[PDB]
Ligand SMILES: Cc1cc2nc3c(=O)[nH]c(=O)nc-3n(C[C@H](O)[C@H](O)[C@H](O)COP(=O)(O)O)c2cc1C
Ligand SMILES: Cc1cc2nc3c(=O)[nH]c(=O)nc-3n(C[C@H](O)[C@H](O)[C@H](O)COP(=O)(O)O)c2cc1C
């Protein structure tokens with residue numbers, strides 16, 4: 001049994017990939033992800049200029065998950081574009097580039113430059129609809145009229161199929177609104193649910209201290225903490241966006257967790273915290289575990305159960 | 314060494330109490346909570362009329378926490394008012410009464426009738442704002458205009474100090490806006506952070522099914538999943554509402570978890586999922602555990618560390 005699959009006019013050996021920001025910032029990291037058994041990779045979200053990001057410590061992990069306030073450290077867009085255009089071996093697996101400009105204009109400028117590389121090489125865009133704190137203003141995907149604007153301007157500037165990285169929502173009216181926004185854009189062909197659960201706070205009892213330096217310890221949560229949140233977002237968007245793909249991200253440590261994401265609707269399954277903690281060897285384990293659950297159940301393909309979570313009545 | 318607190322013109326033996334909805338629906342439940350070692354109790358959120366709530370199964374628990382869509386089952390306001398007015402033994406501990414009307418008028422009608430019993434008997438109101446208003450709109454506390462309306466109307470109708478049960482927020486701009494709304498209302502004397510993390514989805518891998526019946530499996534999350542979210546919300550409101558008390562709720566299973574809440578700013582500490590799972594014996598364990606951490610650290614009272622979480626630099 002193999003798990004190869006066909007999305008966005010690309011072929012994938014399996015549905016696994018890193019989550020943006022994990023093992024993907026440097027050329028070393030991208031080559032390591034390309035050498036792994038993952039089905040695809042995605043670059044660190046980028047800005048027009050290089051950034052050092054926030055002061056350390058800015059990531060910590062724990063048995064139930066991680067917290068981070070990285071601050072968008074990256075090598076800058078020119079580097080990731082060069083990686084895409086000149087360095088990546090597309091014979092090995094597909095590449096996604098994540099962009100997270102600090103304004104709409106910065107994102108439009110990056111997308112106009114990516115477009116011909118996308119056409120020439122097939123690199124795929126993941127637009128990160130997360131943002132820095134601006135007092136008096138929520139992140140873009142939490143401001144639905146702002147989100148509609150970004151997406152209008154990117155669609156126009158880019159002109160090619162792309163995807164969007166979403167934060168979690170917690171309210172069914174918000175699912176309805178967000179998905180309606182996304183469905184106004186036919187070039188949005190995948191939706192990645194979810195980014196980290198925003199602005200949690202981990203405290204060390206012995207030291208009586210927060211554990212990350214930025215933002216008085218507040219940071220985004222990943223890992224075990226967030227799996228039901230992630231599943232809920234995957235399935236909410238799966239149900240609301242039938243003409244799009246949904247990529248699942250959040251809380252995947254095992255092939256069973258990936259199974260759950262696929263049952264909820266996921267096409268690709270992205271691995272953040274667990275990959276950060278275990279390293280790239282995780283991909284062979286995930287694939288073996290997923291194939292074992294499939295075999296036990298009699299499933300021969302991912303399509304047999306994608307989106308097929310059962311409700312009661 | 315001492316767990317006593319004196320706040321809101323009451324004396325509490327210790328900071329622990331049930332979270333609303335857990336072990337508090339029936340007279341039997343309320344008598345059980347009263348007979349426990351908890352420092353206080355709160356009643357099930359009520360409506361004007363009795364409700365059967367949602368179809369079962371509607372609550373499930375797992376190693377990392379719980380999911381529920383109970384649908385507000387309760388015996389109705391008159392019952393809880395009678396319990397406050399005639400049945401509760403206030404010499405044992407303080408009582409809070411939670412109200413969760415399905416419109417602002419229903420809340421007004423309840424608090425006008427509660428007011429005299431509050432004044433005579435000293436029952437304390439906790440107004441649930443994580444609660445539907447118009448379907449297709451967000452819950453009340455995710456709609457800042459609705460929230461302001463609810464608070465203006467309840468403040469006028471009730472005329473006495475009360476508190477509010479808040480959902481978690483995930484964006485700094487929402488912390489800022491929410492707290493600013495609360496700080497418009499001087500009668501809001503305590504803020505309970507947090508209600509369950511909304512619209513999670515737990516899926517059973519073996520059965521391939523969601524585990525609760527209502528809402529196609531979507532429900533609010535409690536327990537280990539939500540502790541860093543809870544701590545963040547306690548701390549954020551602690552910092553932003555210096556003239557109010559913050560009560561902590563979410564992910565408390567141990568004295569250590571409680572100590573973390575208290576470091577974050579909690580006065581009272583509410584126990585939901587863990588109490589549902591363990592039963593009321595949990596309160597003696599929590600008290601002993603908290604006192605053991607205080608002894609190791611040399612703390613003699615709760616005020617010596619409440620709000621004293623350290624940040625880096
Ligand atoms: C250290 C770190 C850095 C991240 N950087 C980014 C980023 O650059 N872009 C992004 O879209 N998400 C970023 N994320 C979010 C992850 O892609 C992912 O959405 C989140 O961690 C949840 O998945 P998990 O439970 O597997 O960790 C980052 C996460 C971590 C832990
Ligand atoms: C079965 C159940 C019923 C609940 N009912 C209510 C309620 O009536 N009113 C309310 O404010 N919160 C209610 N909640 C939320 C809890 O009060 C609490 O905010 C949440 O469970 C998080 O705390 P925990 O992590 O200790 O479970 C309920 C939670 C559970 C599990």
Ligand SMILES: COC(=O)c1ccc(CCCCc2c(C(=O)O)[nH]c(=O)[nH]c2=O)cc1
Pocket residue numbers: 021045054068069070071072073100128130131132133195196214215220
């Ligand atoms: C808080 O300090 C800041 O300057 C700052 C904080 C956050 C940002 C935006 C981060 C977007 C990239 C990202 C990161 C990250 O780089 O911090 N972490 C995540 O969990 N998800 C993400 O999408 C930009 C600046």
Ligand SMILES: COC(=O)c1ccc(CCCCc2c(C(=O)O)[nH]c(=O)[nH]c2=O)cc1
Pocket residue numbers: 334358367381382383384385386413441443444445508509527528533
């Ligand atoms: C989902 O179907 C319904 O009919 C319905 C669902 C929910 C409500 C509001 C519930 C408020 C009480 C409450 C409950 C609850 O009783 O379901 N559960 C929580 O975790 N926190 C709460 O604050 C009212 C009706």
Ligand SMILES: C[As](C)(=O)[O-]
Pocket residue numbers: 021022023024025026029
């Ligand atoms: C593996 As690294 C510090 O470039 O994310």
Ligand SMILES: C[As](C)(=O)[O-]
Pocket residue numbers: 297298299
């Ligand atoms: C997946 As079967 C063949 O057990 O319904």
